[PDB]
Amino acid sequence: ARARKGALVQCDPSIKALILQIDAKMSDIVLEELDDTHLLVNPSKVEFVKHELNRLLSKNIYNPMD
C-alpha cells in the first residue's frame, strides 16, 4: 500500500553520492533511494538540486584556461 508522487531520475552511483552530499550540506531535501540508477527527490527542489549539480561539476573541473 504505497504509491506516492516523486521525481525519479535515472542516475549513477557517483551522482547518487553527490545527491547524498547535497543532503549532507543541507539536509532533509532528497526523499528516498531505490538503487544507483533510481533516486527519489523533493519535486519542489528538483531545479534547486539541478543548479547545485551545475555548481557540483563546476567544483569538479572548473576548467580555467585563462
- List interacting residues with another protein (CB under 8 A): 2-3, 5-11, 13-18, 20-21, 36, 43, 46, 60-63, 65
Residues 6+ away with beta carbon under 8 Å from 60: none
In the bound state with another protein, the residue whose beta carbon lies nearer, of 7 and 29, is 7
Q: How far is the CB of 55 from another protein (least distance, A)?
A: 14
Report d(CA 50, CA 23) in Å as an integer.
13
The residue assigned the cell 538503487 is 35
Write down the least CB distance from residue 28 to another protein, Å. 19
